[PDB]
């Protein structure tokens, strides 16, 4: 019969403005704390003791330069719980030690779990297939590989991305100079999936909007659609002929078309995640050995591949002393790699 | 009719397997020329003195490259923006040393791709369609113009155009970051929102339509056979899809109008990529990303670094190393 | 021997052949440089 | 260039094995009914 579990199930699944669900018990606290943690840190909290950086509006940063920065390298991979052995329950010290970083990363991870459970739960209630939850596995693979696996393979959370606009840009440039990440075929597949997904988004939207049937008298054509109508609002047959004659091939099956729109960006993000798992271990696509053997013996042999390595060497030497303060690097002027004049 | 009329009727014929059209009569020869030169150069061209310093860079497969490292190398900095067709060289050997193939390829490509866009207008007209697919294509097309023509014009040399190759592309990006701080430029940030968002909405729309396909097949056949080309009824239940997505977020955050939805799918990546293209095209005139180097200062005046200052250190490493033999004077002014 | 009632015919249409060959060939064009190294 | 000597057969089998899988499946679809 209707026990307390079923009575609770009733209330959780009420059709209200913001659906709750069983998944909401996990999703809403964790999403709220991750977002609230980020807003709290970027507004008020420094990175002076972990990075030697200002990182909050309170210190004078703007929206592009605020961040919640990773903990000091000496923390290792500490969970850095507020009640843990590092902060010992002291909220102020916890903030100064980087506790908001693991707070956001961990509540964010469980919030993402809660969101994907929500996608399953709602799909089951309204009676649709759960492909939206399936497609969301790609955001999850990215978050887990970049914010958890990658630093877990490295020396500490310090080398995870810090949560901020400019901080993420630094992460990109670090990956170029140290990992040569642009050369990695798993990143290249990710790029193809993202740009190919954006291409499909644009071309499908434009094709539908330009093969519409005239279903009203208005020159603005949005009102000539009824959600309950049975008929296609655009001509698949005309769309197919156009693209066949323009590009050589065209979709003819709308079910395949829309599955392909799931497949392409979702697969790309999954591939990029695999490459980052490799970079967790410094298992890079850094070099082509045949190129290096030839270049070492032949000082006239030059390609764009060898040119980019010189850029990477500059990035490493010029950014490492300030970007890795725990190493206490001191690079005398005379050892810095530089071309002529610059 | 007369031969000119029959010719015009064939050119503009809606029955050709691939549409030709008047834009097509320019597109077809120019794209064939660019393709053929590109393929031959990518395989067999000798090294090119891209930076005008008699330091030739090898781009082709036969001269030591693989697919990832190979490129058609931009024309020499000594040429600058000068027009360098084959007949301006004393010999093909000279033409090749100075990067002649690059100019031939990008100029034929840009012309052919512009006609590709016009051809998309033209066929839509012949088929009785609405006309704006070509406007969506203007976004990638404008981006190609930005990296192959506008950036060279602003910097004064086709040697600074994007190379035609995978690693050459990365070289262009890294040098661009050093010289313009493009990551800190809001038009590139809009570009990222455009392509991340485009990929997101692609996956979203794909997943939502796929989730609401109407049952027309058995467990042992592809559900794709439930749709037949040209059927009049919609193949998924948009009311169910909206009922799902509106509960995922909230009701008014979801599209119930398919025309509105597909307009949004077109507009978001197209507008974002327009701003990407305009980012490159305005950094072509050295209006660069935000510079917050030493913006935060303590009470005494000590510099308090931010993440922007760490970006600056990385940019410096790129700056001091790029084109390591090309600069004689202390400022890189183009 | 009595036949198995669980057997099913398998299909691959021409478009799927073309899509699959494109995937394989492009993956090969991409990864081959790293196989040769 | 001093390339990896297994790269040729790696690339060849990478192409051939899944391609022939697809060709086998395609041709036996055409021959049905």
């Amino acid at each position: 019969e209707r026990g307390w579990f079923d009575i609770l199930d009733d209330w959780l699944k009420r059709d209200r403005f913001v659906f709750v669900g069983w998944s909401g018990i996990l999703l809403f606290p964790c999403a709220y704390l991750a977002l609230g943690g980020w807003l709290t840190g970027t507004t008020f909290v420094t990175s002076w003791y972990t990075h030697g950086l200002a990182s909050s509006y309170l210190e004078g940063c703007n929206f592009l330069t605020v961040a919640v920065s990773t903990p000091a390298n000496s923390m290792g991979h500490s969970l850095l719980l507020l009640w843990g052995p590092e902060a010992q329950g002291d909220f102020t010290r916890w903030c100064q030690l980087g506790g908001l970083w693991t707070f956001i990363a961990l509540h964010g991870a469980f919030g993402l779990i809660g969101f994907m459970l929500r996608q399953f739960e709602i799909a089951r209630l309204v009676g649709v297939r759960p492909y939206n939850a399936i497609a969301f596995s790609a955001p999850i693979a990215v978050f887990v590989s970049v914010f958890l696996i990658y630093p877990l393979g490295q020396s500490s959370w310090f080398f995870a991305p810090s949560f901020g606009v400019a901080a993420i840009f630094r992460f990109l440039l670090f990956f170029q100079g140290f990992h040569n990440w642009t050369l990695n075929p798993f990143h290249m597949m990710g790029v193809a999936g993202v740009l190919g997904g954006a291409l499909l988004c644009a071309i499908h939207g434009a094709t539908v909007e330009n093969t519409l049937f005239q279903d009203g008298e208005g020159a603005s054509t949005f009102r000539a659609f009824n959600p309950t109508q049975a008929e296609e609002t655009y001509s698949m047959v005309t769309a197919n002929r156009f693209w066949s004659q323009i590009f050589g091939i065209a979709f003819s099956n709308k079910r395949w078309l829309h599955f392909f729109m799931l497949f392409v960006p979702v697969t790309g993000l999954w591939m990029s995640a695999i490459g980052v798992v490799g970079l967790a271990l410094n298992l890079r696509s850094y070099d082509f050995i045949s190129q290096e053997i030839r270049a070492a013996e032949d000082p006239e042999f030059e390609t764009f591949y060898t040119k980019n390595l010189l850029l990477n060497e500059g990035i490493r030497a010029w950014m490492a002393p300030q970007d890795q303060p725990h190493e206490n690097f001191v690079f005398p002027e005379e050892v810095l790699p530089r071309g002529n004049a610059l | 009719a007369n031969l000119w009329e029959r010719f015009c009727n064939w050119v503009t014929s809606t029955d050709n397997r691939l549409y030709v059209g008047w834009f097509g009569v320019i597109m077809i020869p120019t794209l064939l020329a660019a393709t053929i030169c590109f393929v031959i150069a990518f395989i067999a061209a000798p090294p090119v003195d891209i930076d005008g310093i008699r330091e030739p860079v090898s781009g082709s497969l036969l001269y030591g490259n693989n697919i990832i490292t190979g490129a058609v190398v931009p024309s020499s900095n000594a040429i600058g923006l000068h027009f360098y067709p084959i007949w301006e060289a004393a010999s093909l050997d000279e033409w090749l040393y100075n990067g002649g193939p690059y100019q031939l390829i990008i100029f034929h490509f840009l012309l052919g791709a512009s006609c590709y866009m016009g051809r998309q207008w033209e066929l839509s007209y012949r088929l009785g369609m609405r006309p704006w697919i070509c406007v969506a294509y203007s976004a990638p097309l404008a981006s190609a113009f930005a990296v192959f023509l506008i950036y060279p014009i602003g910097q004064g040399s086709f040697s600074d155009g994007m190379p035609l190759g995978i690693s050459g592309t990365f070289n262009f990006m890294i040098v661009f970051q050093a010289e313009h701080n493009i990551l800190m430029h809001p038009f590139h940030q809009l570009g990222v929102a455009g392509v991340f968002g485009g990929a997101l909405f692609c996956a979203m729309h794909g997943s939502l339509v796929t989730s609401s396909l109407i049952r027309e097949t058995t467990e042992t056949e592809s559900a794709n056979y439930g749709y037949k080309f040209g059927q009049e009824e919609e193949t998924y239940n948009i009311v169910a899809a909206h009922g799902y997505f509106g509960r995922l977020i909230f009701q008014y955050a979801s599209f119930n109008n398919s025309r509105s939805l597909h307009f949004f799918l077109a507009a978001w990546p197209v507008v974002g990529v327009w701003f990407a293209a305009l980012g490159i095209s305005t950094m072509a005139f050295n209006l660069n990303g935000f510079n917050f180097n030493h913006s935060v200062i303590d009470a005494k005046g000590n510099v308090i670094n931010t993440w922007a200052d760490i970006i600056n250190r990385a940019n410096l490493g790129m700056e001091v190393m790029h084109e390591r033999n090309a600069h004689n004077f202390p400022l890189d002014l183009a | 021997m009595e036949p198995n009632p669980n057997r099913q015919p398998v299909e691959l249409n021409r478009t799927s052949l073309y899509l699959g060959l494109l995937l394989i060939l492009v993956l090969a064009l991409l990864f081959s440089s790293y196989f040769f190294n | 260039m001093e390339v990896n000597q297994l790269g040729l057969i790696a690339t060849a089998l990478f192409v051939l094995v899944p391609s022939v899988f697809l060709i086998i499946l395609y041709v036996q679809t055409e021959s049905q009914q």
Binding site: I249, S252 | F229 | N13, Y18, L21, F36 | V3, G7, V15
Partner: peptide, 30 residues
């Protein structure tokens, strides 16, 4: 052997384009 391999794969792709376009399964209104 590397160059032959790269150009061979590329040539197969171009041939595939030809067949995918001119010898496609024709779209038919059902």
């Amino acid at each position: 052997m590397e160059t032959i391999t790269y150009v061979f794969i590329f040539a197969c792709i171009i041939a595939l384009f030809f067949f995918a376009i001119f010898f496609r399964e024709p779209p038919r209104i059902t």
